[PDB]
Amino acid sequence: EGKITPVSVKKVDDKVTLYKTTATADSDKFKISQILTFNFIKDKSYDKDTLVLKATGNINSGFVKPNPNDYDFSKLYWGAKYNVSISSQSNDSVNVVDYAPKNQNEEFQVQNTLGYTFGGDISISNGLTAFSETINYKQESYRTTLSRNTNYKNVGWGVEAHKIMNNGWGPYGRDSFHPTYGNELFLAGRQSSAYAGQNFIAQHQMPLLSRSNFNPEFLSVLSHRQDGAKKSKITVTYQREMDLYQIRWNGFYWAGANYKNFKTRTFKSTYEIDWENHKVKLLDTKETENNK
Numbered sequence: 001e002g003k004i005t006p007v008s009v010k011k012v013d014d015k016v017t018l019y020k021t022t023a024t025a026d027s028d029k030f031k032i033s034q035i036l037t038f039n040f041i042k043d044k045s046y047d048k049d050t051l052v053l054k055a056t057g058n059i060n061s062g063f064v065k066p067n068p069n070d071y072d073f074s075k076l077y078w079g080a081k082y083n084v085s086i087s088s089q090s091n092d093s094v095n096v097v098d099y100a101p102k103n104q105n106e107e108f109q110v111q112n113t114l115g116y117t118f119g120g121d122i123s124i125s126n127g128l129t130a131f132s133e134t135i136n137y138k139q140e141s142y143r144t145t146l147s148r149n150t151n152y153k154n155v156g157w158g159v160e161a162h163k164i165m166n167n168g169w170g171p172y173g174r175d176s177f178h179p180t181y182g183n184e185l186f187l188a189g190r191q192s193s194a195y196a197g198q199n200f201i202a203q204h205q206m207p208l209l210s211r212s213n214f215n216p217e218f219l220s221v222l223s224h225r226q227d228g229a230k231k232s233k234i235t236v237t238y239q240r241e242m243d244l245y246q247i248r249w250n251g252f253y254w255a256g257a258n259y260k261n262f263k264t265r266t267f268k269s270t271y272e273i274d275w276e277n278h279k280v281k282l283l284d285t286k287e288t289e290n291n292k
Contacts, residue, residue: 016131020038022035023038030062032267054219063076078211081158083156096220108138113128167205175260186206243261
């Protein structure tokens, strides 16, 4: 649910003209916000139309504090993985040809630059030409990977909990397990004389992505062959995988357990891209939930 700005035009040379329009689709319910900036590149010196889509906005973590009154057993929910997916849904003349990030990245701050050269050349470089754009996002303790289903009409990224330190302990992940103490990701003490609900580490000691939100910045380059239909369908999906982290006192020690993707909240928008008129039109929005 949102709006689409009118097209701004920027004549570069006499060969290239840049067209820009921003679409916003939100899920108040899941606290997910999609800001999609479509940069159309018309270059008379190249036999393909180029679309540089910058996806930004917000994806809440879905974090839920533990009940401080839980005595021997307690749990919390945390934002363990953020997935953003872009899919060319129709028109065989359109393909996903490039994107940023283009490779796995576990740096605390992901910064890339995507440049388009008169003639059609797309160059992606580390850090912050007829057109240029940048992606910049913080993901401390997490890792960005390219989704497995990435192909000639699809691109996706996953920003997942990777190396999380408790204090000096760790690093821990969604999968870590001590033969005795289980997953110790957010366990404050193995022998704490405390309520279960009060034996997790403080929220400020957890990664910002696990208990706050993720502000995505991703770029995808769609290419149109200049033959066949002038419009094509595209879907953009922002999603969070929430893990159920729980601790329990067995009379001797505390042990943790992390249920991977125990709750899922997904927001998908579908747009019709008009390559001739450099406009986009919202066709559909869909909120979906998964609860184990």
